[PDB]
Amino acid sequence: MQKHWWHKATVYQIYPKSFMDTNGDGIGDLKGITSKLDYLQKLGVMAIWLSPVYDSPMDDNGYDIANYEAIADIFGNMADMDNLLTQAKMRGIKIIMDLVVNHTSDEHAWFIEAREHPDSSERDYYIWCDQPNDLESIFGGSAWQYDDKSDQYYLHFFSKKQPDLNWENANLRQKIYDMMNFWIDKGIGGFRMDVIDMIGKIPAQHIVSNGPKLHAYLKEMNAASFGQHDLLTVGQTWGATPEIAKQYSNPVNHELSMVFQFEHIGLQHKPEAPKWDYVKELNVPALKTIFNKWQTELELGQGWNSLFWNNHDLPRVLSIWGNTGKYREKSAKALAILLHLMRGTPYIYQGEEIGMTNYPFKDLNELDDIESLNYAKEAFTNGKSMETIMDSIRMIGRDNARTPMQWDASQNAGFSTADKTWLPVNPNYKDINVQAALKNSNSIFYTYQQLIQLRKENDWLVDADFELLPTADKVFAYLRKVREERYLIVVNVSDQEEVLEIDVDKQETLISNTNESAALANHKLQPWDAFCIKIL
Ligand SMILES: OC[C@H]1O[C@H](OC[C@H]2O[C@H](OC[C@H]3O[C@H](O)[C@H](O)[C@@H](O)[C@@H]3O)[C@H](O)[C@@H](O)[C@@H]2O)[C@H](O)[C@@H](O)[C@@H]1O
Ligand SMILES: [Ca+2]
Ligand SMILES: [Ca+2]
Numbered sequence: 001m002q003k004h005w006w007h008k009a010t011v012y013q014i015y016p017k018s019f020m021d022t023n024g025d026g027i028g029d030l031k032g033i034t035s036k037l038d039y040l041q042k043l044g045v046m047a048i049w050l051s052p053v054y055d056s057p058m059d060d061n062g063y064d065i066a067n068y069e070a071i072a073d074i075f076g077n078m079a080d081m082d083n084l085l086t087q088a089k090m091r092g093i094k095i096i097m098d099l100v101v102n103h104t105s106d107e108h109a110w111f112i113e114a115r116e117h118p119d120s121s122e123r124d125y126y127i128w129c130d131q132p133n134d135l136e137s138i139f140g141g142s143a144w145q146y147d148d149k150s151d152q153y154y155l156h157f158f159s160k161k162q163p164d165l166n167w168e169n170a171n172l173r174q175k176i177y178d179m180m181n182f183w184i185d186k187g188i189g190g191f192r193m194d195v196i197d198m199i200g201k202i203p204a205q206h207i208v209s210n211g212p213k214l215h216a217y218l219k220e221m222n223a224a225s226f227g228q229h230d231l232l233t234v235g236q237t238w239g240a241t242p243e244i245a246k247q248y249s250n251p252v253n254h255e256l257s258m259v260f261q262f263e264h265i266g267l268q269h270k271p272e273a274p275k276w277d278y279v280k281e282l283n284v285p286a287l288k289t290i291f292n293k294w295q296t297e298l299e300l301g302q303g304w305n306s307l308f309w310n311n312h313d314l315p316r317v318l319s320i321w322g323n324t325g326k327y328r329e330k331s332a333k334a335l336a337i338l339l340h341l342m343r344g345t346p347y348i349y350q351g352e353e354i355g356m357t358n359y360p361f362k363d364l365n366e367l368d369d370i371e372s373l374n375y376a377k378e379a380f381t382n383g384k385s386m387e388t389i390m391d392s393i394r395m396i397g398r399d400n401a402r403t404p405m406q407w408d409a410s411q412n413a414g415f416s417t418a419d420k421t422w423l424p425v426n427p428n429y430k431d432i433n434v435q436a437a438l439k440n441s442n443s444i445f446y447t448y449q450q451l452i453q454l455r456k457e458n459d460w461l462v463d464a465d466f467e468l469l470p471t472a473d474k475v476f477a478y479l480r481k482v483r484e485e486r487y488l489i490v491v492n493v494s495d496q497e498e499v500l501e502i503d504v505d506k507q508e509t510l511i512s513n514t515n516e517s518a519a520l521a522n523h524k525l526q527p528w529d530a531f532c533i534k535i536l
């Protein structure tokens, strides 16, 4: 397999509005990000997946873009963007921009022209109809919004302020490629593609994800822009299966580097039910089966996996599948070890490296995400009390991943000097913060740092196969094998002691959050024990 710079890379996702505020408006900005590049360099990440910082009304906080080639006032300006690029590069960190082209803001110049002048070319940049079908919006309601100005419905799988682009229009696709090349020319390291598996949509036929022309568009996009370069492109694909992922990531297809698959995240809610009907108790056996399948199916020179626990749209891993009490740190380390030692490119969400958690939202007013507010509005009139609604939101609400990054124990956790922050800082910041984590030699931060270094200095993390071992339900163990080197990863994913009925000859310990020797010798695992040892 041809190796690229990103094959040894670990990506760090930054949610711009909640990373670092440098001008006291209570909202993170580009200068704030740039001011923390030394930190990220210490962590050792090679790239930053930067969520949207483009001009936007912020109806969906950046994913509703009004201008693909201008920075939103709140984040700063193009000069700030350029400096981030240059300062990051100087520290060996590439910037991966968030590519949101399945839709734009209804305040984008193209849509304004499409609505005001139905005969214009840009009218066809969007999807209109006289007779709407039953397609629904992901944020609630019909996916069709009637426009009384032109007397037609426009499609929007997301919010009403995010009209869908018409990917059947070759001229629209071209303008998207011109825009992508605008960014490529500035020296970015790649693109994270927002719900990219939706561009093959055919609404008339109720075809949304995995449309028939989907891969053809990606091949066309590749050839017209990033293909000739050596960038990292990761597509967000909810409708992806291992076979489809191969189509995406096998380099011979000339499409993407990898994609984000959400099969494991699916274990967070009852099957066939909205994410709001969550499941607290992680089904470890199911997880083993899912991870094992993706590690097995996407073999070398056949596909490449992306590895992640959470992002800006998901609950922080500790709150959903980890321990937020007595074993916060240990569980956090255990989950990090379990994921990063598999084959693929791991993604760390800001704050994950210090073990931040979800926020205890008390009422609707304290929220910001349109998705949560829409769900609440609808649930309230359908048999759900406000408390029940707030309980679901405290667990699954997207705002849980958007509270300010916790840097220290000062005001606003060192995130801002403002009276208040756009989203409230978690009270646990007094205990959970970057300064304290950097001070404690055995904090969660260093575990991530060590995992990152191992991946940067060892070919086996890339070349070794994956084999799931037969163990107790809550024990997640597997080996990575290449030639004659054998690495055993054992992670006790539970708050209880578990049995480890195995016998091996330990050669060396690569990383451990406990006494690996005692666990091996006693054939028992203390809660959240996690380690990787090279064995004979
Ligand atoms: O730009 C809009 C939105 O796009 C990305 O996230 C998409 C979306 O992903 C999840 O929902 C997808 C999932 O929703 C239901 O389950 C449907 O039934 C499925 O078909 C569909 O795959 C997530 O739950 C949403 O919150 C999220 O909006 C960006 O990452 C988002 O930030 C952005 O808002
Ligand atoms: Ca600011
Ligand atoms: Ca009218």
Ligand SMILES: [Ca+2]
Pocket (backbone or CB within 6 Å): 024, 417, 418, 419
């Ligand atoms: Ca102040």
